[PDB]
Design a protein around this ligand. Structure first.
Ligand SMILES: *[C@@H]1O[C@H](CO)[C@@H](O[C@@H]2O[C@H](CO)[C@@H](O[C@@H]3O[C@H](CO)[C@@H](O)[C@H](O)[C@@H]3O)[C@H](O)[C@H]2NC(C)=O)[C@H](O)[C@H]1NC(C)=O
Ligand SMILES: *[C@@H]1O[C@H](CO)[C@@H](O[C@@H]2O[C@H](CO)[C@@H](O[C@@H]3O[C@H](CO)[C@@H](O)[C@H](O)[C@@H]3O)[C@H](O)[C@H]2NC(C)=O)[C@H](O)[C@H]1NC(C)=O
Ligand SMILES: *[C@@H]1O[C@H](CO)[C@@H](O[C@@H]2O[C@H](CO)[C@@H](O)[C@H](O)[C@H]2NC(C)=O)[C@H](O)[C@H]1NC(C)=O
Ligand SMILES: *[C@@H]1O[C@H](CO)[C@@H](O[C@@H]2O[C@H](CO)[C@@H](O)[C@H](O)[C@H]2NC(C)=O)[C@H](O)[C@H]1NC(C)=O
Ligand SMILES: *[C@@H]1O[C@H](CO)[C@@H](O[C@@H]2O[C@H](CO)[C@@H](O)[C@H](O)[C@H]2NC(C)=O)[C@H](O)[C@H]1NC(C)=O
Ligand SMILES: *[C@@H]1O[C@H](CO)[C@@H](O[C@@H]2O[C@H](CO)[C@@H](O)[C@H](O)[C@H]2NC(C)=O)[C@H](O)[C@H]1NC(C)=O
Ligand SMILES: *[C@@H]1O[C@H](CO)[C@@H](O[C@@H]2O[C@H](CO)[C@@H](O)[C@H](O)[C@H]2NC(C)=O)[C@H](O)[C@H]1NC(C)=O
Ligand SMILES: *[C@@H]1O[C@H](CO)[C@@H](O)[C@H](O)[C@H]1NC(C)=O
Ligand SMILES: *[C@@H]1O[C@H](CO)[C@@H](O)[C@H](O)[C@H]1NC(C)=O
Ligand SMILES: *[C@@H]1O[C@H](CO)[C@@H](O)[C@H](O)[C@H]1NC(C)=O
Ligand SMILES: *[C@@H]1O[C@H](CO)[C@@H](O)[C@H](O)[C@H]1NC(C)=O
Lengths: 211, 345, 427, 49
């Protein structure tokens, strides 16, 4: 993916291109008259006596000082931008390479698992290993299940139904489980919840008590 | 055109100053491209356009004040439509581009190119309709799926169940919602109504966006008003210096005018670069808030509202975004006697 | 080629490029002037026998007449013709208001004193010009024509003379601590002192005759114009107008400006005249400068193809040839001013790119939701950018969707960290 | 006062340049206001004392 795509490291090459363009413009601004008789100090000095050469030399000085000031100001602005990007990169390295971040889309499209740093010219490349769900399936769901006079809510999961029986799974992976008392908790009766369905919550102690 | 408008004698002198206009144009072009990239980064997070929910029964939650209104020329929600009337260009000095800056209005005009002194306002790449469509897609994906549409394929879930998930997110069990569902829905609807009323009543509600416009018009009115300064020359008009003085004693006043106008342009470009950096920081923050709060539930404190974050809803506004942060706030405390542990046998 | 010259490169990459204006803008001129037809009284300023002395220089207000300054400008009878704030060649076409002509006589060494911002004896006590002065000073030698103690001056003025003022009082100047009793003593002298001009005394003391002409401007509609010819005004074309001395380049177009009768010029926020009242016919013609300059070319890259599209910023597709002055352009430029591929976007008129009804991702951002792309035979196509794929998850209460599988995906985030450390030796 | 310190002639000569003195004052005032905004943002988080 990195090799086939031509402009993969576009933002890393833009730094080099911008620096080169700025330096080339600064060099080329040394060939401008700025109003003087010539853009070469030696030509001004070798043709004019000092009282009249001072005017042209002052014009050249003003123009070149303006060019240098423009270069320094744009470099300060660009350095502020690069500092912001480097602070973001340092935060990303701290929170994603040295840990696991719960922030959404901070370190990739999907649930973050890990990240790997790779140095690159004038920057860093993070490879974000993430978890993406796939192969969804539609089930019938219920907020709670009404046992004999009691309302049962899933402890850590969700109630689904494959058409006739009811299971409790985890919300990020279809792992149906038999709805038992260790899977759910009771929070009242079957009157307040809107959408509560009738089912049976198996108790993993009655078979032991029978025998 | 700003420095030496349609004057060849002035253009030849301006050529002696090197590539300064080229640098100014490059900087302004970079600023404009960055301005487009800011909107693209904030709103074009997910590029799956989810249709506005047709089934308008979400267990009590209303959502009508934030979903698009079909009975409007533009598919803008009532809150969005109310937000678009609070940012005005009436006080902006460069409001004069109201001369139908899309193809002229009366005979030929040629405004926003050669009617002013070279200053133009390019149109944004993403129209307000496209930004509204992006916002509506985000809202529909949040309602139908929750946080699942920003981390993979969208997975449908009933809204009360998603609110139970988001209640579990902040450390409150599911039954707390499944029992007071009606109370929570009524509180949510009342809060949205209060938000609409407060936006409609307070005049300076959108002070952060307006203060941006007032900062970009004032920067432009200074640019035109500096064309009336002679900067030490005999006049502030090149057409009068050229029509009165001969070339050899006119190129000393034209040089002064050129230097002054170049200095004014450089000042404008520098201040605009700094302002663009500030706006880029704000746009990065807005993109982060859209990623971590519209597309998920954030545990960061005070990042997305005062309280325990439940969810958030985006609404496009002129040159910005308004997040409605729905949060859970404890209330009606009660004193109890507590112990670290309980000593059984 | 305009784009290649704007970037100073022979290879142009894909995208939109705003292009600088390299085209032939200027055209013919008009000299519309008022209807005044009478010669000014300039004859009795230079051919008069009587000339009041420098201490009592005589001033005349010339107004509401034409005056060929070339007849004075070509005569060889003058020696110094020093014009300040104006050029003698351009004195012809320029129409001034309320011209003033002062005349006097001085000596040879005193001619240099007649100049703005200069300290002397007559320049400080008899005739002082303003520090800034728009006009001319014409001094000519008249040695064997006026020499005789008639001419006098004010040797002893109190402090100095305010510019453009006269003082012919004969009171005796006080030049000491002793109060001046009234008669000239040791501390009192007569300011009115005369030097007898001699026919043979030396070049320095040879009499000179001096006339100062001051043309004040920006003082309501001007009257004293030159020997110009009122040409017929031409609208809807680039011109070089000279409306009562209001020189400028641009296009004159009939306007709806109210222009109350006393108002004559009209101006915009930048204090630039964007309208005029024609002196012949009281019609309002707003001035729109030529040299469009608002042009951006769309290039698929010179590596791919030499085809280009052209976007004119806010021009209307019908008015594209009227703007950019396509009549004066080269035939290769004229192909992009009109054709069968004109398309009016909210960002302007796009010529050379065919509009398609499909929607793809934005390749070259044109603006206002419109993008362009080089697609296949091959040509540049302009479309409306597609926001994204159109899906829909069917919301259904009591129904959930659960993933039965996963995917491990490795993304890639590039972040610049540092830039080149550079140093510049300022000296 | 910085450029033309107590001089009518210099002040009149400075008027030839445009709003080159109001612009600097506006920028400095904006910075000064932003400093107070920063201090309020960092510390005045919870208004209850
Ligand atoms: C979601 O909330 C909105 C309001 O935020 C509800 O719309 C409101 O519906 C009521 C009852 O129909 C409207 O009151 C009456 O409507 C018509 C207007 O011609 C008329 O009979 C009366 O003058 C009166 O106003 C109310 O106007 C309307 N509000 C708005 C802003 O349109 C909506 O019903 C709720 N959705 C539900 C309950 O599913
Ligand atoms: C003051 O009086 C003198 C008197 O000499 C005027 O100078 C004369 O001006 C006339 C009209 O411009 C000149 O006539 C011209 O002469 C030649 C003939 O070859 C030609 O250029 C024209 O066809 C025209 O006839 C005349 O030569 C000239 N005389 C001298 C001795 O220079 C002067 O114009 C009067 N006015 C002022 C303001 O000085
Ligand atoms: C839903 O799942 C249940 C539990 O896995 C299925 O019921 C079982 O079906 C298998 C295969 O026929 C039998 O061996 C088991 O005895 C069944 N269990 C019970 C408790 O009856 C059921 O068939 C599934 N339903 C659908 C529609 O797929
Ligand atoms: C779940 O089972 C309960 C058992 O109590 C059902 O409640 C009974 O419903 C019938 C029919 O409406 C009423 O006549 C009884 O009076 C109800 N009994 C009680 C104790 O409330 C309930 O309807 C069942 N749910 C479903 C969906 O069948
Ligand atoms: C939410 O689910 C409930 C489950 O009861 C739906 O209510 C039933 O809908 C069916 C199908 O139209 C009707 O035959 C029943 O009479 C409804 N029952 C009751 C008690 O009203 C409800 O329609 C679902 N919501 C939506 C918007 O479809
Ligand atoms: C819980 O007890 C605290 C004291 O431990 C109560 O705080 C009192 O609040 C009242 C009303 O503001 C004040 O007049 C008292 O001075 C407070 N006492 C102290 C010691 O600060 C608090 O109100 C109680 N909370 C509830 C909900 O009853
Ligand atoms: C109730 O708390 C008391 C006080 O800590 C405990 O009393 C101690 O009991 C043990 C065992 O009988 C004695 O040896 C200690 O002397 C008692 N302490 C005191 C201070 O009298 C008692 O064990 C606790 N009971 C329970 C059930 O936890
Ligand atoms: C059911 O799941 C399928 C994919 O398994 C999907 O196409 C469909 O939209 C889902 N929803 C409904 C209501 O059938
Ligand atoms: C000036 O004369 C021309 C004809 O030479 C005439 O058309 C015009 O109306 C006149 N202007 C005035 C103001 O009378
Ligand atoms: C300007 O464009 C509009 C459509 O935007 C068109 O109706 C009108 O005719 C154009 N103007 C002229 C003068 O042709
Ligand atoms: C393209 O769409 C326009 C409306 O935008 C329609 O008038 C025209 O017929 C369409 N052309 C084709 C070839 O489908």
């Amino acid at each position: 993916s990195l090799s086939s795509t031509p402009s993969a490291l576009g933002k890393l090459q833009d730094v080099v291109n911008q620096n080169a363009q700025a330096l080339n413009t600064l060099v080329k601004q040394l060939s401008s008259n700025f109003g003087a008789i010539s853009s070469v100090l030696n030509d001004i000095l070798s043709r004019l006596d000092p009282p009249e050469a001072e005017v042209q030399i002052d014009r050249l000085i003003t123009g070149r000082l303006q060019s240098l000031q423009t270069y320094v100001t744009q470099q300060l602005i660009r350095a502020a931008e690069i500092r912001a990007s480097a602070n973001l990169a340092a935060t990303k390295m701290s929170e994603c390479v040295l840990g696991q971040s719960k922030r959404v889309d901070f370190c990739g499209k999907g649930y973050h698992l890990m990240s790997f740093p790779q140095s690159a010219p004038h920057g860093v490349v993070f490879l974000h290993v993430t978890y993406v769900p796939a192969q969804e399936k539609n089930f019938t769901t219920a907020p709670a299940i009404c046992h004999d006079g009691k309302a049962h809510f899933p402890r850590e999961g969700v109630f689904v139904s494959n058409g006739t029986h009811w299971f409790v799974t985890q919300r990020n992976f279809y792992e149906p489980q038999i709805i038992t008392t260790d899977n759910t908790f009771v929070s009242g009766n079957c009157d307040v919840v809107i959408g509560i369905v009738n089912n049976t919550v198996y108790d993993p102690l009655q078979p032991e008590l029978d025998s | 055109m700003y420095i030496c408008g349609d004057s060849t004698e002035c253009s030849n002198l301006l050529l002696q100053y090197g590539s300064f206009c080229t640098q100014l144009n490059r900087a302004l072009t970079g600023i404009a491209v960055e301005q487009d990239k800011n909107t693209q980064e904030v709103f074009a997070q997910v590029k799956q356009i989810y249709k506005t929910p047709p089934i308008k029964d979400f267990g009590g939650f209303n959502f009508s004040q934030i979903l698009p209104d079909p009975s409007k020329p533009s598919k803008r929600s009532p809150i969005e439509d109310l937000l678009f009337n609070k940012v005005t260009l009436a006080d902006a000095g460069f409001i004069k581009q109201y001369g139908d800056c899309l193809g002229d209005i009366a005979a030929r005009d040629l405004i926003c190119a050669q009617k002013f002194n070279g200053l133009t306002v390019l149109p944004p790449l993403l129209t307000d309709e496209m930004i509204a469509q992006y916002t509506s897609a985000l809202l529909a994906g949040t309602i139908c799926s929750g946080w699942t549409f920003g981390a993979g394929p969208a997975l449908q879930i009933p809204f009360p169940m998603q609110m139970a998930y988001r209640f579990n997110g902040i450390g409150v069990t599911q039954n707390v919602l499944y029992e007071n569902q009606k109370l929570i829905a009524n509180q949510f609807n009342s809060a949205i109504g209060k938000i609409q009323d407060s936006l409609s009543s307070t005049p300076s509600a959108l002070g952060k966006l307006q203060d941006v416009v007032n900062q970009n018009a004032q920067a432009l009115n200074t640019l035109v008003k500096q064309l009336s300064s002679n900067f030490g020359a005999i006049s502030s008009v090149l057409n009068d210096i050229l029509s009165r003085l001969d070339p050899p004693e006119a190129e000393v006043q034209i040089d002064r005018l050129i230097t002054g106008r170049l200095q004014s342009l450089q000042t404008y470009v520098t201040q605009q670069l700094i302002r663009a950096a500030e706006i880029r920081a704000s746009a990065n923050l807005a993109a982060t808030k859209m990623s971590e709060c519209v597309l998920g539930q954030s545990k960061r404190v005070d990042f997305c509202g005062k309280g325990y974050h439940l969810m958030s809803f985006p609404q496009s506004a002129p040159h910005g975004v308004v997040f409605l942060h729905v949060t859970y706030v404890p209330a009606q405390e009660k004193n109890f006697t507590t112990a670290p542990a309980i000593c059984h046998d | 080629s305009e784009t290649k010259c704007t970037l100073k490169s022979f290879t142009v990459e894909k995208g939109i490029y705003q292009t600088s204006n390299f085209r032939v803008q200027p055209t013919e001129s008009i000299v519309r002037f008022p209807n005044i037809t009478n010669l000014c009284p300039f004859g009795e300023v230079f051919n008069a026998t009587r000339f009041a002395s420098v201490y009592a220089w005589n001033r005349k207000r010339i107004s509401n007449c034409v005056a060929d300054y070339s007849v004075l400008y070509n005569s060889a009878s003058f020696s110094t013709f020093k014009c300040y704030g104006v050029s003698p060649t351009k004195l012809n076409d320029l129409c001034f208001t309320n011209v003033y002509a002062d005349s006097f006589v001085i000596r040879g060494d005193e001619v240099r004193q007649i100049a703005p911002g200069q300290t002397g004896k007559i320049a400080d006590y008899n005739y002082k010009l303003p520090d800034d002065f728009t006009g001319c000073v014409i001094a000519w030698n008249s040695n064997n024509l006026d020499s005789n103690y008639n001419y006098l001056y004010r040797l002893f003025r109190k402090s100095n003379l305010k510019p453009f003022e006269r003082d012919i009082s004969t009171e005796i100047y006080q030049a000491g601590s002793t109060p001046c009793n009234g008669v000239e003593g040791f501390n009192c002298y007569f300011p009115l002192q005369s030097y007898g001009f001699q026919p043979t005394n030396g070049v320095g003391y040879q009499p000179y005759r001096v006339v100062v002409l001051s043309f004040e401007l920006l003082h309501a509609p001007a009257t004293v114009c030159g020997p110009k010819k009122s040409t017929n005004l031409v609208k809807n074309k680039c011109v070089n107008f000279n409306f009562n001395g209001l020189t400028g380049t641009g296009v004159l177009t009939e306007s709806n400006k109210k222009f109350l009768p006393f108002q004559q010029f009209g101006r915009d926020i930048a204090d630039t005249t964007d309208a005029v009242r024609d002196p012949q016919t009281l019609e309002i013609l707003d001035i729109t400068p030529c040299s469009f300059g608002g042009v951006s070319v769309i290039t698929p890259g010179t590596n791919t193809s030499n085809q280009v599209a052209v976007l004119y910023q806010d021009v209307n597709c019908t008015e594209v040839p009227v703007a950019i002055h396509a009549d004066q352009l080269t035939p290769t430029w004229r192909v992009y001013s009109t054709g069968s591929n004109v398309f009016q976007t909210r960002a302007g008129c796009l010529i050379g790119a065919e509009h398609v009804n499909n929607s793809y991702e934005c390749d070259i951002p044109i603006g206002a939701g419109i993008c362009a792309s080089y697609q296949t035979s091959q040509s540049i196509i302009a479309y409306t950018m597609s926001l994204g794929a159109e899906n829909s998850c069917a919301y259904s209460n009591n129904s959930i969707a659960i993933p039965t599988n996963f995917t491990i995906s490795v993304t890639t985030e590039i972040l610049p960290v540092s830039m080149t450390k550079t140093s510049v030796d300022c000296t």
